[PDB]
Each structure stands twice: as C-alpha cells, then as structure tokens.
Tab-separated table of C-alpha atoms in Angstrom:
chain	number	residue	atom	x	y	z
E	53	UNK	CA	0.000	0.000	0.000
E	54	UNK	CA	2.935	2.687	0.661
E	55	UNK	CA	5.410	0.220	-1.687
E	56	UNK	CA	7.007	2.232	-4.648
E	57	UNK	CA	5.161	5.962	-3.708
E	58	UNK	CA	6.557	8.729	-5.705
E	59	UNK	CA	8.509	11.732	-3.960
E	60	UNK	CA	5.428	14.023	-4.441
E	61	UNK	CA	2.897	11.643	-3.293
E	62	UNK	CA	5.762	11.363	-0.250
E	63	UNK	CA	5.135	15.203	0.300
E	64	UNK	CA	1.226	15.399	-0.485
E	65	UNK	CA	0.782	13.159	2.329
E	66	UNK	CA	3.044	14.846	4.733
E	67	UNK	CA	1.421	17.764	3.826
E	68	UNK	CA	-1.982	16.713	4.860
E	69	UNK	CA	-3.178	17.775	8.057
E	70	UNK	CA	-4.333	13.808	8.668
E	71	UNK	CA	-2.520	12.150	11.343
E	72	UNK	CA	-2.918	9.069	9.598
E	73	UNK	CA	-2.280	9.661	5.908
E	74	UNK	CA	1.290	11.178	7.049
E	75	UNK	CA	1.980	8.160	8.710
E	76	UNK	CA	1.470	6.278	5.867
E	77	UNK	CA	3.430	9.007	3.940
E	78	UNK	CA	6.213	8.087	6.205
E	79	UNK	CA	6.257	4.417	6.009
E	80	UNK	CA	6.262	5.068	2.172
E	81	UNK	CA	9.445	6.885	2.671
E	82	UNK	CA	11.132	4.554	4.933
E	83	UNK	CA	10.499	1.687	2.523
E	84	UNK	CA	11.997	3.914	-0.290
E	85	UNK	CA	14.758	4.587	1.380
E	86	UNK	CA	15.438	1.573	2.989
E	87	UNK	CA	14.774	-0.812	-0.509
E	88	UNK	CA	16.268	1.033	-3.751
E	89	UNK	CA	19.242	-0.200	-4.465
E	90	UNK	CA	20.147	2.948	-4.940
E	91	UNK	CA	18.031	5.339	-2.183
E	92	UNK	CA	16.631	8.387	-2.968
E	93	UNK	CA	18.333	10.341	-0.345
E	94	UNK	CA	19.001	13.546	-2.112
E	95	UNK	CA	15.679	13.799	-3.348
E	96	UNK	CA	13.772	13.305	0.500
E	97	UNK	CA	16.022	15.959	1.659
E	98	UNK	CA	15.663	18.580	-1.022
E	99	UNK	CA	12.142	18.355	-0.819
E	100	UNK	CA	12.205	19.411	3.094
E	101	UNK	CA	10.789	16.440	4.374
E	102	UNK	CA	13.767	16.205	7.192
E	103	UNK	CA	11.576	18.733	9.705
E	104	UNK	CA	8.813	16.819	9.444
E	105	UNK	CA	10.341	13.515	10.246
E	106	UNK	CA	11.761	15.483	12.769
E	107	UNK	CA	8.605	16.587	14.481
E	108	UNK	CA	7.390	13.405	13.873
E	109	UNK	CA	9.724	11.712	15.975
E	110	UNK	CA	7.844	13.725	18.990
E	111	UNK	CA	4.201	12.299	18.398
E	112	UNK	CA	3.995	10.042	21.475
E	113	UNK	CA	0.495	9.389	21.068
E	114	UNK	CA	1.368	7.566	17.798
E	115	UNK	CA	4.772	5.347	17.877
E	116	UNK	CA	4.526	4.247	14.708
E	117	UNK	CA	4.760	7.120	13.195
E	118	UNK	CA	7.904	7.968	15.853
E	119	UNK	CA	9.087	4.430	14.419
E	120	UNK	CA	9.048	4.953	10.366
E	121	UNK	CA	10.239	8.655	10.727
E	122	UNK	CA	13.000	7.296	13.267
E	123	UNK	CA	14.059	4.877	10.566
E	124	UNK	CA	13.677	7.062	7.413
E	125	UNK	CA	16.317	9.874	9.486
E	126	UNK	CA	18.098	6.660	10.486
E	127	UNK	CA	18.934	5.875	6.737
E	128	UNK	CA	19.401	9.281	5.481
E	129	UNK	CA	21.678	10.330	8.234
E	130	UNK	CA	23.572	6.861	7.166
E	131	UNK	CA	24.795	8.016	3.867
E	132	UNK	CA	27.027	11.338	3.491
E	133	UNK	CA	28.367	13.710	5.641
E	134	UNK	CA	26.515	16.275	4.051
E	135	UNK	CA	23.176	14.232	4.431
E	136	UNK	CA	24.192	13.430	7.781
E	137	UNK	CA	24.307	16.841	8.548
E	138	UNK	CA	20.965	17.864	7.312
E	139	UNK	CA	19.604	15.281	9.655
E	140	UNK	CA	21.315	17.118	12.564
E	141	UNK	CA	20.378	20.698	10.907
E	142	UNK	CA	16.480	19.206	11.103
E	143	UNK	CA	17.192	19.296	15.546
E	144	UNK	CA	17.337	15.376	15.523
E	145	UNK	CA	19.710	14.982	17.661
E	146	UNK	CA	17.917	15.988	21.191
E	147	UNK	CA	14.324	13.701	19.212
E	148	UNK	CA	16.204	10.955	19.136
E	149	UNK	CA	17.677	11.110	23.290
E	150	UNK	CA	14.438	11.654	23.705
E	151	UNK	CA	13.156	9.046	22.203
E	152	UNK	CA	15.663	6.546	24.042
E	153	UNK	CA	13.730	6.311	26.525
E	154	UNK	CA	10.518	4.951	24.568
E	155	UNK	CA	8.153	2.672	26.142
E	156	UNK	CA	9.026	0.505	22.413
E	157	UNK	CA	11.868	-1.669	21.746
E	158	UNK	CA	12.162	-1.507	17.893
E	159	UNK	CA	11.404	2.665	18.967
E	160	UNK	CA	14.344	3.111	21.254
E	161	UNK	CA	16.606	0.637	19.193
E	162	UNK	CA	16.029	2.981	16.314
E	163	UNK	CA	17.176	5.811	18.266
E	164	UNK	CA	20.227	4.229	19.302
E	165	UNK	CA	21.231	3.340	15.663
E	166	UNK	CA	20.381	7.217	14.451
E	167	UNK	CA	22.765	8.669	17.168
E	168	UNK	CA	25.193	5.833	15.840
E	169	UNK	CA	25.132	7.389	12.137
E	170	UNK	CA	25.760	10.923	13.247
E	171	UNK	CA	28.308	10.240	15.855
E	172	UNK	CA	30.064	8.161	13.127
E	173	UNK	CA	29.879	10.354	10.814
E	174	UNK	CA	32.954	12.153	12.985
E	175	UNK	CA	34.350	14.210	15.988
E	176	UNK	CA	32.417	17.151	16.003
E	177	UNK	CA	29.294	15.126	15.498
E	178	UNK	CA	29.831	12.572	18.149
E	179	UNK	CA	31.077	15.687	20.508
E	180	UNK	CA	27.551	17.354	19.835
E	181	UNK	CA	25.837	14.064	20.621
E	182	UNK	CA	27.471	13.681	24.110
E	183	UNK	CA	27.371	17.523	24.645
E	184	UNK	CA	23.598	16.811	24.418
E	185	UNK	CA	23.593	14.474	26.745
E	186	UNK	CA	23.274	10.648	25.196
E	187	UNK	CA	25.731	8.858	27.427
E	188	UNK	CA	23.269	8.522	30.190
E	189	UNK	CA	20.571	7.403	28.654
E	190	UNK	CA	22.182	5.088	26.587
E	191	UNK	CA	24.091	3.626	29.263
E	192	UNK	CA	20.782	3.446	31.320
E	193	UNK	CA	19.704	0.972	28.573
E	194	UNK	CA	22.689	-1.686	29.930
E	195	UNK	CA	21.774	-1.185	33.258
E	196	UNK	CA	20.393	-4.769	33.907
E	197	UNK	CA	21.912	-7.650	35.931
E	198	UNK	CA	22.727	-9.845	32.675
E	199	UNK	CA	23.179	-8.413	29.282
E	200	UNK	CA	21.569	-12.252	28.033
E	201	UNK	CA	18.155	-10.627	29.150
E	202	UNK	CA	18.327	-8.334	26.051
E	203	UNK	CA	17.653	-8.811	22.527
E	204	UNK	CA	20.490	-10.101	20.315
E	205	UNK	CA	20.158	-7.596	18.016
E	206	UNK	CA	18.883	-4.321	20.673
E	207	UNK	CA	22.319	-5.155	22.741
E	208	UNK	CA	24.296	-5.104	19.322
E	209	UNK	CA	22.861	-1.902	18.302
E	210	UNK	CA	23.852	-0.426	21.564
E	211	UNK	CA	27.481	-1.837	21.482
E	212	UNK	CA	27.958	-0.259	17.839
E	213	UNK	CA	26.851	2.863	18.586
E	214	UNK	CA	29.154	2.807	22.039
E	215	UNK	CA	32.223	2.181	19.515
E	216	UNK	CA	31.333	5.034	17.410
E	217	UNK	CA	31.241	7.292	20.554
E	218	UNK	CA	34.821	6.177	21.084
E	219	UNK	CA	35.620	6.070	17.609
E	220	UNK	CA	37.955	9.290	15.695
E	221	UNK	CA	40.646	10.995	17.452
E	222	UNK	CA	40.984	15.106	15.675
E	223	UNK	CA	40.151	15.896	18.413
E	224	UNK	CA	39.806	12.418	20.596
E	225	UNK	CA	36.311	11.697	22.475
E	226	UNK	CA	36.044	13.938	25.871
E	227	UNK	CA	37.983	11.991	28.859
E	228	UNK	CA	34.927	12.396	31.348
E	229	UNK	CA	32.803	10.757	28.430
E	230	UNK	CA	35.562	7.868	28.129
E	231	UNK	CA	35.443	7.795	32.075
E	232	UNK	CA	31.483	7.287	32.184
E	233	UNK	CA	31.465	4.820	29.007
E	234	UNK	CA	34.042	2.739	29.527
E	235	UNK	CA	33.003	-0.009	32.637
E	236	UNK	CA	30.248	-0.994	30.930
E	237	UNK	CA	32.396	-1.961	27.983
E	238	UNK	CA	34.649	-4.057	29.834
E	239	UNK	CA	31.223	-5.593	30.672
E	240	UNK	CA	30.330	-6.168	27.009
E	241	UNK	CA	34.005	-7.331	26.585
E	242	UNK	CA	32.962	-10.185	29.128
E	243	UNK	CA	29.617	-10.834	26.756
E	244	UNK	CA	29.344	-14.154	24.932
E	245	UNK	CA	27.805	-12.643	21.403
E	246	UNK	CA	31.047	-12.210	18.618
E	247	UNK	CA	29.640	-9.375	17.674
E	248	UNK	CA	29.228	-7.789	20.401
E	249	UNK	CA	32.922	-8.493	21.422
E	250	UNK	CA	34.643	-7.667	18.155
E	251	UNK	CA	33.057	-4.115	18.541
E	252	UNK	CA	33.996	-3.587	21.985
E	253	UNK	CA	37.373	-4.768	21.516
E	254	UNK	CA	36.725	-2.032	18.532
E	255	UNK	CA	35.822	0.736	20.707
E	256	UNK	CA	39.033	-0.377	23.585
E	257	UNK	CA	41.509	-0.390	19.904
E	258	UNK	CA	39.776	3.016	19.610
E	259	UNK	CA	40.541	4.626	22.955
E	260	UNK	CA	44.084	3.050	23.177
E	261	UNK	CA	45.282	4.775	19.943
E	262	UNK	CA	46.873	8.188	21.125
E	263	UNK	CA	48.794	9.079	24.177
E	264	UNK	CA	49.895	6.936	26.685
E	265	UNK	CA	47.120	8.662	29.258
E	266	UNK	CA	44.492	7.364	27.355
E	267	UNK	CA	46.312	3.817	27.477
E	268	UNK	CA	46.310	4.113	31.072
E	269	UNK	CA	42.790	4.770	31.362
E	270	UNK	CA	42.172	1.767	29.511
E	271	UNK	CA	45.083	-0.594	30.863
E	272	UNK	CA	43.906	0.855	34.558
E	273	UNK	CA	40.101	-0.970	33.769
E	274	UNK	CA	42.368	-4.199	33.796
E	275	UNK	CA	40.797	-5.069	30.307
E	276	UNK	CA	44.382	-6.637	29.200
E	277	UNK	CA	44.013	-10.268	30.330
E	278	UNK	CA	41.026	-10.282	28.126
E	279	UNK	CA	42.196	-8.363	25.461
E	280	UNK	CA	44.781	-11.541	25.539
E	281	UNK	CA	41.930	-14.042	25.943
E	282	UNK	CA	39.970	-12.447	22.729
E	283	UNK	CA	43.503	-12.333	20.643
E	284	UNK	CA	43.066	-16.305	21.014
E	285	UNK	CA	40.273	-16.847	19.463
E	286	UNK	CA	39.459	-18.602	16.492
E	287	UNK	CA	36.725	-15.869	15.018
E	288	UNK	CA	39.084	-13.217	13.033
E	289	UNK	CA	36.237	-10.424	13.589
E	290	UNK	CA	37.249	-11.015	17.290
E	291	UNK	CA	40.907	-11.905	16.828
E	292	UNK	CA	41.934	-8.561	14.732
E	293	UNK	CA	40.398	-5.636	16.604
E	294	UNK	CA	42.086	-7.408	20.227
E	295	UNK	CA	45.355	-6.969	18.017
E	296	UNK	CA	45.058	-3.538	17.018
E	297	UNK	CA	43.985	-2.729	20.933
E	298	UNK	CA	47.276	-4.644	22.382
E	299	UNK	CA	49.460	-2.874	19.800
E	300	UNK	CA	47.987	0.418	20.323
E	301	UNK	CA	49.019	-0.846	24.298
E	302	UNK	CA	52.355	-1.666	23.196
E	303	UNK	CA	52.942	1.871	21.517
E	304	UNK	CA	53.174	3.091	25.064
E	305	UNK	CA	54.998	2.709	28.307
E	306	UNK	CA	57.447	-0.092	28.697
E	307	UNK	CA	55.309	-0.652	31.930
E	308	UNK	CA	51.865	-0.739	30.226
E	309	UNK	CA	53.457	-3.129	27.637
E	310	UNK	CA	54.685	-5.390	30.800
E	311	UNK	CA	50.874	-5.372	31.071
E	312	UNK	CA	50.512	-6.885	28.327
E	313	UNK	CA	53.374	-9.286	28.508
E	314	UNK	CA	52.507	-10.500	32.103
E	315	UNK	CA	48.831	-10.891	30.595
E	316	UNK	CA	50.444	-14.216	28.098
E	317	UNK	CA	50.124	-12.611	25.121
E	318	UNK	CA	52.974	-13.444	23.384
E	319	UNK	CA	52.135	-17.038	23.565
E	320	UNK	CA	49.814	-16.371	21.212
E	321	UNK	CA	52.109	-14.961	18.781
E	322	UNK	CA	53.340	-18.090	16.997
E	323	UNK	CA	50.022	-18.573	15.567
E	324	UNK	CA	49.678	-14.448	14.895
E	325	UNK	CA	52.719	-14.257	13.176
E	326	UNK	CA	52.230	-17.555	10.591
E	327	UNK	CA	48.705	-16.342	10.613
E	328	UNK	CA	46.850	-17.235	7.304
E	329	UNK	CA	45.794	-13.249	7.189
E	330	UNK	CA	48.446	-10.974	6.028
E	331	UNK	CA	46.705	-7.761	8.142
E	332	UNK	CA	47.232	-10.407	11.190
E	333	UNK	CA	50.632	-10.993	10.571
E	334	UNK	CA	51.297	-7.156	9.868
E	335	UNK	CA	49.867	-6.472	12.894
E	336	UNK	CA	51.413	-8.534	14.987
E	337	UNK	CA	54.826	-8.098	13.688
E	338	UNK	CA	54.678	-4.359	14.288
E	339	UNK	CA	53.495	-5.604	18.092
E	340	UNK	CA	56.289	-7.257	18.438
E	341	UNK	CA	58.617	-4.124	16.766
E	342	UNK	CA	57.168	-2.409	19.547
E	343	UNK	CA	57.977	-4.762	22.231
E	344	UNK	CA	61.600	-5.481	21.222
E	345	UNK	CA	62.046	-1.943	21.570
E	346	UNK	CA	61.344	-2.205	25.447
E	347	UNK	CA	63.529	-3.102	28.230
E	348	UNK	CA	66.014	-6.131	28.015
E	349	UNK	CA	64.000	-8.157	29.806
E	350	UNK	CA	61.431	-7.693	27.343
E	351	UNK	CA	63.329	-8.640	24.454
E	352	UNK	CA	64.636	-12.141	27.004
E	353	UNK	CA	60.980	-12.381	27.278
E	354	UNK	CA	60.860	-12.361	23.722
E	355	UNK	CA	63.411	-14.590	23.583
E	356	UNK	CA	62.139	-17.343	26.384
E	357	UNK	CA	58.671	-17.358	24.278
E	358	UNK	CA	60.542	-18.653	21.054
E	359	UNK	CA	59.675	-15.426	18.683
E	360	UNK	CA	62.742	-14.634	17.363
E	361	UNK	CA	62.191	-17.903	14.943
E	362	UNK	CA	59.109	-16.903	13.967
E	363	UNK	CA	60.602	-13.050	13.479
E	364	UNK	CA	62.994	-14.859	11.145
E	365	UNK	CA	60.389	-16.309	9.259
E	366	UNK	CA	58.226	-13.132	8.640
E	367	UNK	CA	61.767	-11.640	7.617
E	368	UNK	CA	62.190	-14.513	4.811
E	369	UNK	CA	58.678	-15.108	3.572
E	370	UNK	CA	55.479	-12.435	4.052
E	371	UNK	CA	53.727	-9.473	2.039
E	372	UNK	CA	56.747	-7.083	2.197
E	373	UNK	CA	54.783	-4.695	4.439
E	374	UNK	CA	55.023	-7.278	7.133
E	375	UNK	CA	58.236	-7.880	6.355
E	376	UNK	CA	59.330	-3.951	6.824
E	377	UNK	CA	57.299	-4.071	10.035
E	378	UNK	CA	60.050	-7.610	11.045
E	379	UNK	CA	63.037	-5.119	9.579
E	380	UNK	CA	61.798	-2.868	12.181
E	381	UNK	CA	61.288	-4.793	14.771
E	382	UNK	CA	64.866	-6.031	14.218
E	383	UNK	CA	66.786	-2.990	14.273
E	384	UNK	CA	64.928	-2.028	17.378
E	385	UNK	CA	66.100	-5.443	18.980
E	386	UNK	CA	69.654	-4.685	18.056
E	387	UNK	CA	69.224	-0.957	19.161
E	388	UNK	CA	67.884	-2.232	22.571
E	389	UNK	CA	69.612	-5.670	23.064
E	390	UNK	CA	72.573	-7.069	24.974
E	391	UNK	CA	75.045	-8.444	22.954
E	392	UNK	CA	73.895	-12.319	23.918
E	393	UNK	CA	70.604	-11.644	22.631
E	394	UNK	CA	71.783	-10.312	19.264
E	395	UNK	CA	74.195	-12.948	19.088
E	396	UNK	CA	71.105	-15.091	19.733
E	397	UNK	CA	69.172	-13.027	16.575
E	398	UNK	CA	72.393	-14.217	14.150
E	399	UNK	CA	72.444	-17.631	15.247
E	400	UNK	CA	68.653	-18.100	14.564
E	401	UNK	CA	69.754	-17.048	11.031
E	402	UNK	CA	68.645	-13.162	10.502
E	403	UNK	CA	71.484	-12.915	8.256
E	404	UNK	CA	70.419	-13.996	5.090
E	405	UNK	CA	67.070	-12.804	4.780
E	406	UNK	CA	67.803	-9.331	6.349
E	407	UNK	CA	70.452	-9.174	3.362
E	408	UNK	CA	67.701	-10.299	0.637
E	409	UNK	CA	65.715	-7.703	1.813
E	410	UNK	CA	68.481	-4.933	0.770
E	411	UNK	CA	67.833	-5.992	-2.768
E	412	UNK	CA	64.221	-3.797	-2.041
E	413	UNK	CA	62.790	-0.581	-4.042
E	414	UNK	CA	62.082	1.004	-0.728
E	415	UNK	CA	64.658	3.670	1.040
E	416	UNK	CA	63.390	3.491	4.722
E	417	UNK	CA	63.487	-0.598	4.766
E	418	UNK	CA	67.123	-0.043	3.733
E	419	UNK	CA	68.094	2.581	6.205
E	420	UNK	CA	66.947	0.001	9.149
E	421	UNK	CA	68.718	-2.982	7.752
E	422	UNK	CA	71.565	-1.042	7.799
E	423	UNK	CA	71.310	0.269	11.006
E	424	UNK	CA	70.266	-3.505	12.478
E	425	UNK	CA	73.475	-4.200	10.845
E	426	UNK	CA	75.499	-1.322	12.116
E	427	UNK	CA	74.296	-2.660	15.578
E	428	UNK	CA	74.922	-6.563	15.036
E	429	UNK	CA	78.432	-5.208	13.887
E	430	UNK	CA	78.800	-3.168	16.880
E	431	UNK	CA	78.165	-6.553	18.949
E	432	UNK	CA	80.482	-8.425	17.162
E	433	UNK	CA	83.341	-5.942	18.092
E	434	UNK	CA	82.690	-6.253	21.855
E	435	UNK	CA	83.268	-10.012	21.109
E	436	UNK	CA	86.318	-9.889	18.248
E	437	UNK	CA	84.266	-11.318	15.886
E	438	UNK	CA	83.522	-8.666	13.606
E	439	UNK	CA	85.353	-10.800	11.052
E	440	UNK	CA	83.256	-13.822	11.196
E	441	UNK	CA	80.188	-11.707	10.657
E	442	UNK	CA	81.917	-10.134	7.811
E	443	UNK	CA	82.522	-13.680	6.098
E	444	UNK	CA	78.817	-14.769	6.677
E	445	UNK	CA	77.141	-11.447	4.799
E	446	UNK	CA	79.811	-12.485	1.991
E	447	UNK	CA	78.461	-16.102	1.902
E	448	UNK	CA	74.852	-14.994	2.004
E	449	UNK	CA	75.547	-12.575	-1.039
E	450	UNK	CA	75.003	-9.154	0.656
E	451	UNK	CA	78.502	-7.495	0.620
E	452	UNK	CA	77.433	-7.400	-3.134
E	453	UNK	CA	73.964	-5.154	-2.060
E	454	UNK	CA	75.759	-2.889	0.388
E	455	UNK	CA	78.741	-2.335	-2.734
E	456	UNK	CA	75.406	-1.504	-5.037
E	457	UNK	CA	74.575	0.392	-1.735
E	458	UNK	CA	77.522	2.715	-1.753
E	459	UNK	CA	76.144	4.053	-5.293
E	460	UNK	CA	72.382	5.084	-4.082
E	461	UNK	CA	70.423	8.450	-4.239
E	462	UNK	CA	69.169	9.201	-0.422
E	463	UNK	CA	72.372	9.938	1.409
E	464	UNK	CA	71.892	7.795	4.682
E	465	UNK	CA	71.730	4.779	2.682
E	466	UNK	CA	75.714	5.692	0.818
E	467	UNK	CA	76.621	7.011	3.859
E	468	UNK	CA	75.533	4.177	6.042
E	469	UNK	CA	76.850	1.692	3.296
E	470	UNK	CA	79.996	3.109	3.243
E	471	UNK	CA	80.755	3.183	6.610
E	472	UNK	CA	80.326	-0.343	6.679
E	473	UNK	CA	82.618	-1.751	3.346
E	474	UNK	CA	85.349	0.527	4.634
E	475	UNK	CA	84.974	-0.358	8.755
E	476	UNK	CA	84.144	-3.733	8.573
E	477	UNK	CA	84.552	-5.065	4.601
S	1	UNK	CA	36.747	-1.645	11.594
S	2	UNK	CA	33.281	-1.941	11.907
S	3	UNK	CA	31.383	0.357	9.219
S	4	UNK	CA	30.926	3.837	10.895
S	5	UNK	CA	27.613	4.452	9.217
S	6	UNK	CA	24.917	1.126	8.298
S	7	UNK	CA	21.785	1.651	6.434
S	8	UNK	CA	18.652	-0.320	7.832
S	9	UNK	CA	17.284	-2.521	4.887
C-alpha cells in the first residue's frame, strides 16, 4: 500500500493535516529509502521532508509514526556527511535522546542506531551528541543484571553505537565521556555474542590509539588479560580488533606493555605471526617491533617465548609490508639488546634474509637494515668477531647489495653503506 | 573496523 510511492505523493501526504495519511506518507518513505538499491536520499532531503520527520519523531500518542520517521532519518543520516548533517540541521539529535527512553523496543533501538550514524559520521558530530547528553541514557539501557536478558540484536545496536562514541581521534572523544562509558564496555568485553565483542574490543583499539594517558585509562580498567583471551580466538572479527587494541598498548609505556606481557600474550604470537591473514601478521609483527624496543628483559621475554624464529620467518617469507614491520622490529632489537641476545638473533639465522631484503625498491626498509646491521656489527666488536660476521654477509651474497649500496640516491643509505665496506669489509 | 555508518534494509 505505501510500496514504490513517488517523492510528491511522499510530500502530499506529509502535507496533509491527517494524522494518519502522514503516517502512511512516512512508512512510504522509509520503505523507499530503505529498498532502492540505490536510495533516494538527495531527493527526500531537497524536498524538506527532514523537519517533518523530525517533528514526527515527537508524536507520542502515535509510535509508529515515531518508528518509520525514526528509521527514514536513520537511513538518510547513514549516507554522506553532508546528508548526515541535514539530519542534525532538522534538531534530531535531542528527538532521538528523547526518544531513548521509549516505552518501544524496535522505537528506542532505532534511536540508538540514528545517534550511531551521526556520531560516526565524525568528531564534532559525536562531541555534539554527548554535549547533548546521550551517554546517560544510553548507558541506562545496559543497566540490567545480565546483558543475556536483552535482545540479540537491541544489545548489538547499543554496542555499535558505544564504539562510534569512542571512535575518531581530531580531536579524541572527551575523557569524562571515556570515564562514564568505559566499565560498561569491559562488561560487554565479558559478553558471549562475537559481535558484540569484536566491537567492543573495537571501541578499547579506539581509545588506546593516542597518548599513553588514554592507554592508562584503559590498561587501569584491567581489560588486558582479556584483550589476551579475545587475541586467542578462532573468530578473526574477534581476533583482529584485540590486536590492534594490544598494539595500540604496546605503543606506550614499557610498563603498560609489561601489562601486556605479564597478561600471556605473546604465547599467542606463533600462531599471529604464521597467521593465514596478512593484516594479522602485519599487525602482529609491528606488536612485536614495539615490544623489542622495550627493556632487556622484554626482548629475554621475547626470547624465552621462542619469537625470534618466527621473526625470522616473517623476515624470509610475508607481504613485504610485514616484512618492513620484522626489519623494524629487528633494528629495534639490536638498538635495545645485549650483545647475547643479538648474538642469539644471528644464530637463529637473521642474516640472510635481512640481506635479501636490501635488494628492495624502498629507502626506509634499507636505512633500518643497515642500522640492524650497524648494531649486530657493533656486537660483534665487543666479542672480536667482527670478522666472522663479515665472512657470513659475503656467503649470504650481501657485501654485493651494500657495494650496489655505496652508489644510491638518499644519502643515509651511501653514507651508512659506506661506513660499513670501509669499517668492517 | 566496523562500518561507521549502516543503512537499515
């Protein structure tokens, strides 16, 4: 009955002063813009019907028409920025806290995926959200002794638009916001649903990218033994956002990343780093970059867990991202080590492949071999083998790459190159 | 990363 309505019939309707024939005006709007393949979004908007979905969305005496305008914003204020912002030009914003706390379900479930669209569509959205006041409310929808009381999909919803309130960081989400949101997602973090967990370990990877305060906000919760828990399990959806969050960790104190290392996680790292995903094994070799840039007992504990093998591996076969991400890692090893533990690194056989990777079209890969060798070298001379080491980069065929070396446009790399054939070759 | 905007079909 309102299937395939025309834009004009759309606004006749709404135009009516008939309760009822502008609901049914609405619904025909929802279902065009939620069944096109290609919505008519620009078309809704130009012909003003955003103000009176708005106003709609404050009829209490008639939900359903709360309900179809709710959705029709919903889907508009999913597409652009520019069509998001009309939706929050129309005053929908303060409708739809309102309407949070609906007597309805499917009502206040709409809500909560509106306010997810605008607050995603970036920082000064999801600022003007929470500066109207949508934390409360929303979190007053969790507030119940098991989250397995609530609908599958009503909990999801929620969880989402959570992650989108922690989500963007020019400028990063208030800290009194992150303060008031985040124990009740370390709760969802404990939920059972993957979905709900792979966003929540979303919105933690969200709030742990930036400055180590943040971290510490988040690493205070004691969310890291989970984090650890979640980067176990079999379901990638799960497995990838708790390895962005325990990197982001990583990036900051070497006390915050004993967190994480107390926590088990680099048990887990064998199977991370000859993961079947290459952004998995990306990931988790620029984790481990920067943990072997931590203490020395972080590299031994690096060491003790059997990684360096596995760092080898990366180093010889992988996308060549990953494998800059293992170059790093290994000159930040030998920047940090002792000389057992890079002694350790050659016998494990970094040699050869950190040579084939000289033979590479990129100038910052070659600046940290270099300097991983400049460092192994350095080692070797507190030993007297500097001439052993010197023999094995001939075998291996890389004397050959630094000689091409000495000839090469960005002067670190001739420099550095040079430095080396006339010290040690 | 979960999409930051979703449509309701």
């Amino acid at each position: 009955g309102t299937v395939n309505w025309s834009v004009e019939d759309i606004v006749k309707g709404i135009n009516s002063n008939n309760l009822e024939s502008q609901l049914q005006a609405t619904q025909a709007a929802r279902k065009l813009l939620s069944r096109e393949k290609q919505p008519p979004i620009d078309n809704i908007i130009r012909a003003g019907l955003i103000p009176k979905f708005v106003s709609f969305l404050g009829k209490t005496d008639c939900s359903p028409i709360q309900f179809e305008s709710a959705w029709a914003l919903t889907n508009i204020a999913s597409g652009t920025s520019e069509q998001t912002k009309a939706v929050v030009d129309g005053g929908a914003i303060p409708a739809f806290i309102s309407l949070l706390a609906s007597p309805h379900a499917h009502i206040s479930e709409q809500a909560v995926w509106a306010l997810g669209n605008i607050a995603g569509d970036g920082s000064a959205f999801r600022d003007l959200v929470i500066k109207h006041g949508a934390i409360d409310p929303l979190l007053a929808l969790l507030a119940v002794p098991d989250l397995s009381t609530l609908a599958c999909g009503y909990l999801r919803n929620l969880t989402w638009t959570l992650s989108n309130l922690c989500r963007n960081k020019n400028p990063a989400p208030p800290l009194d916001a992150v303060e008031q949101i985040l124990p009740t997602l370390v709760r969802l973090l404990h939920h059972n649903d993957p979905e709900v967990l792979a966003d929540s370990c979303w919105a933690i990877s969200y709030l742990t990218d930036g400055p180590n305060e943040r971290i510490e906000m988040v690493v205070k919760k004691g969310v890291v033994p989970q984090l650890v828990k979640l980067l176990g399990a079999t379901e990638l959806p799960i497995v990838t956002p708790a390895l962005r969050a325990i990197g982001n960790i990583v990036t900051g104190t070497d006390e915050q990343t004993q967190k994480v290392i107390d926590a088990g996680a680099l048990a887990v790292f064998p199977s991370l780093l000859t993961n079947p995903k290459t952004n998995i094994q990306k990931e988790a070799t620029w984790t481990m970059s920067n943990i072997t840039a931590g203490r020395q007992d972080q590299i031994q504990q690096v060491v003790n867990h059997g990684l360096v093998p596995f760092l080898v591996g990366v180093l010889s076969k992988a996308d060549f991202k990953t494998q800059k991400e293992a170059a790093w890692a290994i000159t930040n090893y030998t920047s940090g080590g002792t000389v057992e533990q890079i002694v350790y690194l050659v016998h494990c056989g970094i040699i050869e492949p950190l040579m084939n990777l000289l033979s590479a079209k990129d100038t910052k890969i070659i600046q940290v071999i270099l300097d991983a060798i400049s460092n192994i070298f350095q080692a070797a001379e507190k030993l007297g083998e500097t001439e052993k080491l010197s023999i094995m980069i001939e075998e291996c065929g890389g004397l050959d790459k630094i000689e091409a070396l000495q000839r090469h446009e960005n002067e670190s790399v001739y420099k550095a190159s040079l430095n080396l054939i006339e010290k040690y070759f | 990363p979960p999409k930051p905007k979703k449509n309701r079909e």
